[PDB]
Amino acid sequence: MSERPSDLVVNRLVLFVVKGTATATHNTVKPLILLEELGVPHDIYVVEKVSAPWFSEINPHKMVPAILDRSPDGRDTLRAWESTSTLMYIADAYDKDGTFGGRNVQERSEINNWLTLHTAALGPTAKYWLYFYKLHPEKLPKTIEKLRSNITVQYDILERRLNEPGQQYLALKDRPTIADIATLPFAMKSTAELFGLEFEKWPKLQEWSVRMGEREAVKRAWQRVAGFGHGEKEYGMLE
Amino acid sequence: SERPSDLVVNRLVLFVVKGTATATHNTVKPLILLEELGVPHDIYVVEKVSAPWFSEINPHKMVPAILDRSPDGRDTLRAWESTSTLMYIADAYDKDGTFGGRNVQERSEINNWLTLHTAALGPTAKYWLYFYKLHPEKLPKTIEKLRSNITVQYDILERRLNEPGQQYLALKDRPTIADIATLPFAMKSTAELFGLEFEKWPKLQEWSVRMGEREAVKRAWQRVAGFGHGEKEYGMLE
């Protein structure tokens, strides 16, 4: 039980973030979107150093987002880490009716297909693109271009799906799911421009990104995640 | 697109390709769980994943994929991405939550360690294999960075399996879909392929042997190697 900071108490779901940074909030915004959609009571904890031993006991991958929350019976503490895992946990614990998690086996079969496509393909591809483009000490343009090429193939797959009759969202025809929440940050105009792509080439994907973008929970989430650690308090439990 | 005449969905159909070392490490995952639960299923060997009819099942044009009957029996379901096939089989056929998790607490850890494989080790290993074998140009600096990232993932798994009583990745007591998703990318043969000495991660090695001794895992490895090398080369197997 490595000593946690004195202000870290779990009276409700605690979402772990870092100081809002331009282009670096696209994973932390995912669980925040779902919390806002379902109206889940939650706290925000701004982590000063993800390398801190106390945080690695919450998330051994030493990244945000991460979640501490009380168990359903209220006896123990639960944890969720990896952005897709935080969406799965919130849905399981707080999406009673399966509005975002899926109501039956059939709905969940497509939700998990399009969620896992993001988790395995576009997500890690975008992560590696960003790493070799900005973070790696040496510039490897041959690697960068192959990763950019793979993003266009992923956009083609999403575009094909959203060109199917009545398919307004990725998984279900009628409403957005945790599949749509997971994909949005990596499939919108701002991100397409960062990748050096013209988003207009995927018109049904662009229309979908605007339809998701207009949701109040999404607008609230984007505004909040940018501001964390730039308010009255820099690090620790926000008020 | 018109399907082949032999493709009928009377039960769960697992789509695979001809068995080779480099083509079975994802398809074996759903097969392990089908064998663990004793789910009735057919095997369909796909000649060309580029075939239009297959892209209607999986737009990503890869195996494994699944077509199955809905619970009510009215409609057909599809699952694609190996993690998604594990999720589907658990949802439809793991009625006791033996591999899927019995409560919110169990599922919280299962989804943490399953998603870790799905987001980190899985794609990292996939990219390592692509640049090492498939990419026309050799990019050693890229390959080495991916190799380094594999050792970091092994380090995380080793740390977890050094925790008191933690016999499996997610739960202490039994293996889950998290352990099934990880096994093919965390065993001696795969470590050797990555140019790594697996003995450097002793508790991860011990875990891989414990998983490998399970009868359902042994059957899955034996079967996945043989697909397309029996009496029928492509299509629905007997």
Residue B42 φ/ψ, nearest 5 degrees: -105, 155
Minimal Cβ distance to B156: which of A61, A85, A108: A61
- Provide CB contacts within 8 A for B37, sequence distance 6+: B89, B93, B94, B98, B99
Listed residue (A86, A91, A93, A67) closest to A176, CA to CA: A91
Give A180 to chain B, closest Cα distance, Å: 16
CB contact under 8 A, B80 and A113: yes
Q: Is there a binding annotation on residue A190?
A: no
> CA-to-CA distance for B45 and B233, rounded, in angstroms?
7
Minimal Cβ distance to A85: which of B77, B84, B115: B115
Q: Are B66 and B13 in contact (CB under 8 A)?
A: yes
Task: List C-alpha distances in Å: A178 to A35, A171, A232, B127.
Answer: 11, 9, 32, 26
Final resolution, Å: 2.2
Tell me the chain A residues in contact with residue B137 when contact means C-beta distances shorter than 8 Å: 142
- Burial environment of residue B88 by CB neighbours within 10 A (0 to 12, 13 to 18, 19 or more): buried
- Output the six-digit token pair for B95: 């009625």
- Asked if A61 has any chain B CB less than 8 Å from its own CB, the reply is yes
Q: Are B76 and B70 in contact (CB under 8 A)?
A: yes
> CA-to-CA distance for A193 and A3, rounded, in angstroms?
43
Q: How many helices (H) and strands (E) does chain B have?
A: 10, 5
A183 CA to centre of own chain: 8
CA atoms within 13 A on the CB side of B185: 30
- Output the six-digit token pair for A50: 């993800």
CATH of domain A105-217: 1.20.1050.10
- Output the six-digit token pair for A181: 């929440």
Task: List C-alpha distances in Å: B209 to B32, B166, B168, B219.
Answer: 15, 15, 12, 15
Pairing of strands A236-237, A42-46: antiparallel
| Sequence letter at residue B152 | V
B76, closest residue in chain A (CA to CA): A106
Residue A64 φ/ψ, nearest 5 degrees: -110, 150
Experimental method used, please? Answer: X-ray
Q: A-B interface: how many C-beta pairs under 8 angstroms?
A: 129
Tell me the chain B residues in contact with residue A120 when contact means C-beta distances shorter than 8 Å: 81, 83, 118-119, 122-123
- Asked if the peptide bond before residue B64 counts as cis, ω within 30 degrees of 0, the response is yes
- Provide CB contacts within 8 A for A6, sequence distance 6+: none
Binding annotation of B for glutathione: 26, 63, 82, 126
Query: What is the torsion angle, in degrees rounded to the nearest 10, for the CA atoms of residue A186, residue A192, residue A195 and residue A198?
Result: 160
Fold assignment, B104-216: Glutathione S-transferase Yfyf (Class Pi); Chain A, domain 2 (1.20.1050)
Minimal Cβ distance to A109: which of B79, B111, B118: B79
Burial B117-135 (b: 16+ CB within 10 A, else e): bbbbbbbbbbbbbebbeeb
Identify the three-state secondary structure at position B158: helix
Q: Are A78 and A71 in contact (CB under 8 A)?
A: yes
Task: List C-alpha distances in Å: A41 to A32, A38, A198, B121.
Answer: 11, 9, 39, 33
Which residue has 């075939």 as its token pair? Answer: B51
Listed residue (A232, A239, A227) closest to A17, CA to CA: A227
Task: List C-alpha distances in Å: B121 to B114, B117, B127, B204.
Answer: 10, 5, 10, 14
